[PDB]
Design a protein around this nucleic acid. Structure first.
Ligand SMILES: [Mg+2]
Ligand SMILES: [Mg+2]
Ligand SMILES: [Mg+2]
Ligand SMILES: [Mg+2]
Ligand SMILES: [Mg+2]
Ligand SMILES: [Mg+2]
Ligand SMILES: [Mg+2]
Ligand SMILES: [Mg+2]
Ligand SMILES: [Mg+2]
Ligand SMILES: [Mg+2]
Ligand SMILES: [Mg+2]
Ligand SMILES: [Mg+2]
Ligand SMILES: [Mg+2]
Ligand SMILES: [Mg+2]
Ligand SMILES: [Mg+2]
Ligand SMILES: [Mg+2]
Ligand SMILES: [Mg+2]
Ligand SMILES: [Mg+2]
Ligand SMILES: [Mg+2]
Ligand SMILES: [Mg+2]
Ligand SMILES: [Mg+2]
Ligand SMILES: [Mg+2]
Ligand SMILES: [Mg+2]
Ligand SMILES: [Mg+2]
Ligand SMILES: [Mg+2]
Ligand SMILES: [Mg+2]
Ligand SMILES: [Mg+2]
Ligand SMILES: [Mg+2]
Ligand SMILES: [Mg+2]
Lengths: 132, 177, 328, 116, 208
RNA sequence: CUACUCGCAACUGCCUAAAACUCAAAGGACUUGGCGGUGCUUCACAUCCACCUAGAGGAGCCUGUUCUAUAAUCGAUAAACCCCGAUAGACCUUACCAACCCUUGCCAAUUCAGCCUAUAUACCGCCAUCUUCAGCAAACCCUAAAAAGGAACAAUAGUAAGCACAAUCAUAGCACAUAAAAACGUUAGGUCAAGGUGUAGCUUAUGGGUUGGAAAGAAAUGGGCUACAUUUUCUACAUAA
RNA sequence: ACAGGUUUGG
């Protein structure tokens, strides 16, 4: 039985998101990529240099926004500037959200020597796709 | 059946004979109860599982404007109606049996579901049927084409006259004031 | 959820208005033909499933529908078989049995009066009409249908068909018939063109096992083939490859009546021969009549060869050959 | 005929010793037992005997006698045709025997009534 | 497997269509074969409408071919036919006018007659009964008999020859021996018939 | 079906027949799984046989195992292991050993790091198997009570969201085939050695570095390559020499 | 006794 990126079936009460509700064989069929760049092309290079920075940011944002991050990040890479789209719950005050976004846009940009954009979308709760 | 000794007249060389006097009395009572329900705008369902006159019963129900059921009787039809038929349905106010025993020679399911849901039943019971649960039973024969035609026509005219008299009474009520 | 449906209708209307505004087309002439393309352009979601792509249609199409009202305000069901579970399927069965009894009595009266003016309309071989399938019946009758009930309905239909049908009975039986999806598998013939004072000009294309061949044939010259500038005898030394070229010509008796020039790319010694054969067969249709084209497509000259090499599988040798499976 | 059954089983009303000791209750079930791989016999044995008689007499050559070679093939073809046509004719009709797959459906239409 | 159940076998015979009016019973099926919009498989690369090729020759070449090298088997068959024809021509020119009216020269006819002579009549089938296998004499189908007759000759010409003798040269003699019914293939056929006659007493074990 | 009594042509006996002590159970039927070295039936479209093709067991070589032999890894090791971890071993790889060196010894810091130490019979992450088998299942209804079961298509109490199947998707046009997918679970199956880990053990060592060796075959065996020829070998060459 | 606990996968 395949277990990679596959959440098993419970008694029928667990809420699952649109991403976890799809097996790994649905990538580019029904669900899209969480990261977009040029390193994964045919005649292009720098596949690992972007992958390590992707994983580092996956961990950094998870540690920066604990408990309030709903789903995974959307990491776009477009013309020397990288965009980070996040779906955050509205648990923290707006002042604490702005403090953290201003800290991130100034820390990650200087840490990776490239401009970073951080876009936040506040959801009231985790959007449930399948049974809940 | 043991509950047919008071409803039998005798036995002519093995074949039993039904007493037509009590047959006609019970038939009078059954037809009166059937006509009153049709006059009071009551849903009448002819439930009869018999693969010989399924077409005749459905045609009689079509000509009467009442409903019929001669196919495989589903389990939770009258009990689990809010799940089989729809969200909230209106159960038949009267159930009429033209064949009490189904193809397995066992009592039908509707004859018990009517008593379980408090629904009156008027049924033709043969010498092998159980009239213990039917409200207005009539000891007769449900295997003869002429018998089933006679019963179908009797219920046909009993529904037609009841509906026509209801319409006449409503017409008179419209002129009452 | 009627309020929700109305709110979604209003939202779709205002969103369509704003989409027409932001696209720059006239909102009155703005319809779904433009909606689909505008959405596909503004949200370039490249997926292998079209249903997963963003789509904005009418709410009556987005949200599914269900069964209509069965009983009025008084509660009395409309149909006379509502207490049967399938007020549509059992009504159809009852009407079919009634028409069957009517046809039976009509035929009995005709036999008693010694009149046989009907025929047997059951042999549907040249028409190719097949009966309905479970899906074709469940798309007509909104409610579900069981397999045994479907088989019973089909057998009752064939019973009714096995008897002399009437005037409207023929239409009643045929309204539950589905013929070939197009019923016209006959191919189209390319018109005879004339390029630079060259009459009896035709062109054809063929392919078999990754070998694409184009043939240009002239029906006015002698019988010979020009394969990539060199002779066919020198291009195909094996007898089989030359028989592959002679096969489409021998069936039409056009051995010394057509001069052809073929160009093939890909394949080996037999794939090229098969591709040239297919191209020649598809090109020679412009010189023969319809019956010979039918004979060729029945002989397999106008049909491709889908037998290609299967991809190799992990843990195997030739997509079928498995390793030595030791029992112990 | 059917053997007698009165005064055989052990009941309260029976004054003598019970004669029959049934392993299971003598109730007629509503489904018959499935036939244990109903088999058939060979064919064209008499046609093969007269065919091999030619081989044994004329020292195993077919050019000597020929009708015993053609009738054998005719019998083989007729048996091959009857193996395929009757395998559907006898399963569609019910003149003679019938498989239990139909006996069960015939008994279920008119089953036994143990209760009531 | 790429051909679905709706695909039927092609029809290569040109004469089957070159006379559609000369009959009605054959017209009745040919007028519906296409009107039913029946899909037809592609014509095989080994079979054409040539009047000089034969399905028996095709089957024998396919059974002779080792692996997938088709031109090798084709050349072997060509050399075999040529050697048969030349040996028969030598026997014809070395004979008198009386034997010229009896000695044939048609290689196809000689080959088909040899196959018909080597074609068995009845075979043996091992049936398990009582824990032991008995060789029951069983009538075989025409395709089975022809396949066995071809395989016996092919195996004998493959294994019972010398390294200096070639396959076409050996088959040119095997066909001439099988035509006169004096070859090891006829010997093996007669051995099979004798072993079937010795076991005919076990014919009651067959169930078909 | 015991000792003590009475009686008996019985004398290793028969009839009658206790008590001390031990325990809070001992018992009959039933419902569902599991099991059976007791049975019957079903088919497998590479599957069992009737049958076809090409292979291993004969020779050599490569490679992986079980063994002897050393100071010199380990895991897997019936179907589902054996050119398997490893799509890769002169040092590094390498967790093995022998000689020698260092002990807050990668980080800003931590009476702190670090362990390829044990536990795969504590795990997650990943899979093998039945397995292209289809079944699983919340919410209702029924049973002369309900532990539980719920089916007869010429139909006898069964409806049902969603998860499986199916459909759809990919092999740039259909169909086909292939690919992909295959829930809940069995094998306490494999992986503490991809990685993190609860528990139990190391800290002048089971930790961190340098150098040198990690043989070899008495013997058996799995899987592949070359062939044992004439449909063969060599030469130029698409295949007429 | 107006009773309750205690056998068993149940
Ligand atoms: Mg009766
Ligand atoms: Mg007993
Ligand atoms: Mg029994
Ligand atoms: Mg005793
Ligand atoms: Mg004693
Ligand atoms: Mg096999
Ligand atoms: Mg080999
Ligand atoms: Mg060997
Ligand atoms: Mg070895
Ligand atoms: Mg090892
Ligand atoms: Mg080990
Ligand atoms: Mg282990
Ligand atoms: Mg292997
Ligand atoms: Mg080393
Ligand atoms: Mg070292
Ligand atoms: Mg160490
Ligand atoms: Mg384990
Ligand atoms: Mg299912
Ligand atoms: Mg239950
Ligand atoms: Mg459900
Ligand atoms: Mg699927
Ligand atoms: Mg496609
Ligand atoms: Mg398919
Ligand atoms: Mg697969
Ligand atoms: Mg274990
Ligand atoms: Mg194992
Ligand atoms: Mg370990
Ligand atoms: Mg670890
Ligand atoms: Mg107990």
């Amino acid at each position: 039985k395949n277990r990679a990126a596959r959440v098993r079936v419970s008694k029928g009460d667990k809420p699952v998101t649109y991403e976890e509700a799809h097996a790994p064989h649905y990538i580019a069929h029904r669900k899209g990529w969480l990261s977009l760049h040029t390193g994964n092309l045919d005649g292009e290079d720098h596949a690992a240099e972007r992958t390590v920075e992707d994983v580092f940011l996956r961990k950094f944002m998870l540690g920066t926004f604990p408990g309030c991050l709903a789903d995974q990040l959307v990491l776009k890479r477009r013309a020397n500037q990288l965009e980070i789209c996040a779906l955050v719950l509205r648990q923290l005050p707006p002042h604490k959200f702005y403090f953290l976004v201003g800290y991130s846009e100034t820390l990650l940009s200087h840490f990776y020597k490239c401009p970073v954009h951080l876009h936040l979308q506040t959801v009231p709760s985790k959007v449930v796709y399948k049974y809940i | 059946h043991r509950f047919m000794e008071p409803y039998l007249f005798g036995s002519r060389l093995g074949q039993d004979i039904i007493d037509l006097e009590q047959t006609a009395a019970h038939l009078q009572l059954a037809l009166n109860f059937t006509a009153h329900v049709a006059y009071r705008e009551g849903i009448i369902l002819f439930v009869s599982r018999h693969r010989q006159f399924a077409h005749l019963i459905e045609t009689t129900a079509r000509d009467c404007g009442e409903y019929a059921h001669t196919r495989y009787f589903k389990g939770g039809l009258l009990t689990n109606a809010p799940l089989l038929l729809g969200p909230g349905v209106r159960l038949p106010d009267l159930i009429i049996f033209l064949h009490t025993l189904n193809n397995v020679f066992e009592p039908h399911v509707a004859v018990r579901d009517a008593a379980k849901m408090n629904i009156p039943t008027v049924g033709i019971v043969d010498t092998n049927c159980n009239p213990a649960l039917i409200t207005y039973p009539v000891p007769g024969n449900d295997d003869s084409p002429p018998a089933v035609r006679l019963f179908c026509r009797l219920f046909q005219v009993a529904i037609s006259r009841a509906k026509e008299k209801r319409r006449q009474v409503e017409a008179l009520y419209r002129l009452q004031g | 959820t009627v309020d929700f449906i109305k709110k979604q209708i209003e939202e779709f209307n205002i969103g369509k208005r704003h989409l027409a505004n932001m696209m720059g087309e006239d909102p009155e002439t703005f319809t779904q033909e433009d909606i689909d393309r505008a959405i596909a352009y503004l949200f370039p979601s490249g997926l292998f499933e079209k249903r997963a792509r963003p789509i904005m249609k009418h709410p009556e199409e987005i949200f599914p529908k269900q069964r209509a009202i069965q009983w009025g305000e008084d509660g009395r069901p409309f149909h006379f078989l509502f207490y049967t579970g399938k007020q549509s399927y059992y009504s159809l069965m009852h009407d079919t049995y009634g028409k069957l009894l009517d046809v039976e009595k009509h035929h009995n009266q005709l036999r008693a009066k010694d009149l046989l003016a009907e025929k047997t309309k059951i042999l549907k071989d040249p028409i190719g009409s097949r009966w309905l399938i479970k899906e074709e019946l469940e798309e007509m009758l909104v409610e579900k249908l069981s397999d045994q009930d479907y088989a019973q309905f089909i057998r009752l239909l064939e019973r009714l068909s096995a008897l002399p049908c009437g005037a409207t009975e023929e239409d009643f039986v045929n309204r539950f018939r589905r013929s070939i999806p197009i019923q016209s598998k006959k191919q189209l013939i390319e018109p005879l063109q004339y390029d630079e004072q060259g009459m009896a000009f035709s062109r054809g294309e063929g392919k078999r096992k990754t070998a694409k061949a184009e043939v240009v044939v002239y029906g006015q010259g002698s019988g010979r083939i020009d394969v990539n500038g060199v002779d066919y005898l020198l291009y195909f030394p094996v007898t089989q490859d030359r028989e592959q070229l002679m096969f489409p010509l021998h069936f039409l008796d056009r051995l010394g009546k057509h001069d052809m020039t073929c160009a093939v790319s890909g394949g080996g010694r037999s794939a090229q021969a098969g591709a040239v054969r297919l191209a020649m067969a598809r090109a020679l249709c412009s010189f023969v009549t319809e019956d010979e084209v039918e004979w060729m497509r029945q002989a397999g000259l106008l049909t491709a060869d889908p037998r290609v090499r299967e991809r190799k599988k992990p843990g195997q040798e030739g997509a079928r050959r498995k390793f030595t499976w030791k029992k112990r | 005929a059917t053997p007698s059954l009165r005064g055989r089983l052990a009941r309260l009303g029976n004054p003598r010793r019970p004669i029959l000791k049934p392993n299971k209750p003598l109730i007629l079930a509503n489904h018959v037992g499935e036939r244990r791989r109903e088999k058939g016999e060979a064919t064209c044995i008499t046609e093969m005997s007269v065919m091999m008689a030619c081989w044994k007499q004329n020292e195993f050559r077919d050019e000597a006698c020929r009708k015993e070679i053609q009738d054998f093939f005719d019998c083989a073809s007729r048996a091959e045709a009857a193996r395929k046509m009757r395998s559907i004719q006898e399963n569609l009709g019910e003149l003679g025997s019938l498989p239990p797959k139909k006996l069960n459906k015939l008994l279920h239409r008119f089953p036994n009534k143990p209760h009531v | 497997s790429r051909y679905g159940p709706e695909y039927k076998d092609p029809q290569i015979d040109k004469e089957y269509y070159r006379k559609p009016l000369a009959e009605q019973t054959e017209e009745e099926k040919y007028e519906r074969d296409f009107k039913k919009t029946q899909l037809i498989k592609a014509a095989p690369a080994t079979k054409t409408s040539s009047v000089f090729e034969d399905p028996v020759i095709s089957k024998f070449t396919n059974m002779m071919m080792k692996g997938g090298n088709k031109v090798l088997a084709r050349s072997l068959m060509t050399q075999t036919l040529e050697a048969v024809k030349r040996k028969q021509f030598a026997k014809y020119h070395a004979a008198s006018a009386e034997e010229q009216a009896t000695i044939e020269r048609n290689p196809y006819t000689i080959f088909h007659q040899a196959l018909k002579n080597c074609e068995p009549v009845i075979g043996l089938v091992p049936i398990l009964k009582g824990g032991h296998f008995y060789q029951v004499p069983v009538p075989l189908a025409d395709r089975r008999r022809r396949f066995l007759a071809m395989k016996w000759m092919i195996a004998e010409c493959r294994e019972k020859k010398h390294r200096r003798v070639l396959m076409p040269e050996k088959l040119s003699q095997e066909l001439l021996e099988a035509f006169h019914n004096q070859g090891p293939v006829i010997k093996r056929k007669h051995d099979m018939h004798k072993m079937a006659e010795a076991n005919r007493a076990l014919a009651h074990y067959r169930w078909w």
